[PDB]
Amino acid sequence: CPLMVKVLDAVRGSPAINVAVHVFRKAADDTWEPFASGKTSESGELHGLTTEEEFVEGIYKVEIDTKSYWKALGISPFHEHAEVVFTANDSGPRRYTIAALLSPYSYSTTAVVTN
Amino acid sequence: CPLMVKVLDAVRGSPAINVAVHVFRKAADDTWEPFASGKTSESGELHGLTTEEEFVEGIYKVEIDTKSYWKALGISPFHEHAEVVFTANDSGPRRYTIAALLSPYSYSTTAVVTNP
Amino acid sequence: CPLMVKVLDAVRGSPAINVAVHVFRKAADDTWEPFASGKTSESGELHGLTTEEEFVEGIYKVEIDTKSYWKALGISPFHEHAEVVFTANDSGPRRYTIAALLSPYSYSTTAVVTNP
Amino acid sequence: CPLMVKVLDAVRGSPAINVAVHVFRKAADDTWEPFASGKTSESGELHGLTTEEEFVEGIYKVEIDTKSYWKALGISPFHEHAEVVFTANDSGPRRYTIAALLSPYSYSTTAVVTN
């Protein structure tokens, strides 16, 4: 599993469950092409997005659908979504976890890149 | 001043100076149209991007060029840029401060929105 | 103004107003001695805590009363308070801004330190 | 395992390994008494701090020794340590993860409290 996403809710102190996540890869015409997507599990994680064979070097974008997540909790959010854009590199460590911590008007995202 | 951007460096504990920032507005046709751009100052702030008149309702995207920033300090960072995407002015004009706090493999962004 | 505190509410996207803040300085004897205190204003800022003269080298602790804050808005938060502990002025006088960004079960704190 | 700590390094994009963590419980004379301590593992985690029997309701403080961690990387830090202070409650969910994300001049901490 080369690319995993983990999302937390800073308001409830809990995983952010059932959050839609869409990943895109930049194509040679500079557009974003759908690459992988899913919904975070009960532990706030999304696994099984891609495989080592398919996850080649390139520029990827991970879009986390935060606004629908907050609307379903009845809390007015600021952002349309949270967006993480990065270059995957074979010289780096082999596994990428994109973590995100969500509040209605604020989020952080951290990449944890390991062996 | 309805839209301002403030950027901090979490490594040095200082403003992030000379950070390029590009703002786009989602078009009628669904594309991102260029809306305004500038660089942060010595205080890590970017003012004067737009006017209440020009800054109408819409979906806006504030792209902060964090990669050039880290690279010019000798660091190879994770993200290409930070992107902040939000609907603005849909309940009337507001003043928006988009803050970002940067580290090489992490950032956070916070909006402070006040009723002018 | 060598020491200032700024507090934001990540839920509402606004300054956190009326947040009580207590500052302590580590004593000669190792205890935390009361150093200064105040409440954030309408802009979520606390100024005038100390003076360059009084603010000497030492280890300081800035305690931000985040629990009273959330509770007065009907939220039962995780933390009793946020505590920020740092050595100050050990390479000469500096100006310190202690920023905090609050959510019910999370906060972050950032120092911006500049050479006056 | 009722209380776990997980620490990440925002500068290197990695778990924060070998970070000392000390936990204290507030005693009836208002002092902090040592309760549990350890060093984060290679995955940035610390487990086995306490047991459900011993972790009773009370006010606890978790001190994460960030300053020594940054000094060992040769990076000048701001804080002496990061401190998380909270009341454990039996009405809450039964497991507490104190997560912390560290930079030299900034840190965040989040409690993820689950079943």
Curated annotation (Swiss-Prot), chains B, C:
Changing V21A: In AMYLD1; amyloid polyneuropathy. Changing S68Y: In AMYLD1; amyloid polyneuropathy. The modification 4-carboxyglutamate is found at E33. It is found in: Secreted; Cytoplasm. Changing A82S: In AMYLD1; amyloid polyneuropathy. Not glycosylated under normal conditions. Following unfolding, caused for example by variant AMYLD1 'Gly-38', the cryptic Asn-89 site is exposed and glycosylated by STT3B-containing OST complex, leading to its degradation by the ER-associated degradation (ERAD) pathway. Changing F24V: In AMYLD1; amyloid polyneuropathy. Changing V85A: In a patient with amyloidosis. Changing A36D: In AMYLD1; amyloid cardiomyopathy. Changing I98V: In AMYLD1; amyloid polyneuropathy. Changing G38V: In AMYLD1; amyloid polyneuropathy with carpal tunnel syndrome. GO terms for molecular function: hormone activity; hormone binding; identical protein binding; molecular sequestering activity; protein-containing complex binding. Changing E33G: In AMYLD1; amyloid polyneuropathy. Glycans are attached at N89. The modification Sulfocysteine is found at C1. The modification Phosphoserine is found at S43. Keywords: Amyloid, Amyloidosis, Cytoplasm, Disease variant, Gamma-carboxyglutamic acid, Glycoprotein, Hormone, Neuropathy, Phosphoprotein, Secreted, Signal, Sulfation, Thyroid hormone, Transport. Changing V11I: In AMYLD1; late-onset amyloid polyneuropathy with carpal tunnel syndrome. Changing F78M: Loss of tetramerization. Thyroid hormone-binding protein. Probably transports thyroxine from the bloodstream to the brain. Tetramer dissociation and partial unfolding leads to the formation of aggregates and amyloid fibrils. Small molecules that occupy at least one of the thyroid hormone binding sites stabilize the tetramer, and thereby stabilize the native state and protect against misfolding and the formation of amyloid fibrils. Two binding sites for thyroxine are located in the channel. Less than 1% of plasma prealbumin molecules are normally involved in thyroxine transport. L-thyroxine binds to the transthyretin by an order of magnitude stronger than does the triiodo-L-thyronine. Thyroxine-binding globulin is the major carrier protein for thyroid hormones in man. It is linked to Amyloidosis, hereditary systemic 1: A form of hereditary systemic amyloidosis, a disorder characterized by amyloid deposition in multiple tissues resulting in a wide clinical spectrum. AMYLD1 is an autosomal dominant form due to transthyretin amyloid deposition. Protein fibrils can form in different tissues leading to amyloid polyneuropathies, amyloidotic cardiomyopathy, carpal tunnel syndrome, systemic senile amyloidosis. The disease includes leptomeningeal amyloidosis that is characterized by primary involvement of the central nervous system. This is Transthyretin. The chain holds residues 30 to 145 of 147 of the full protein.
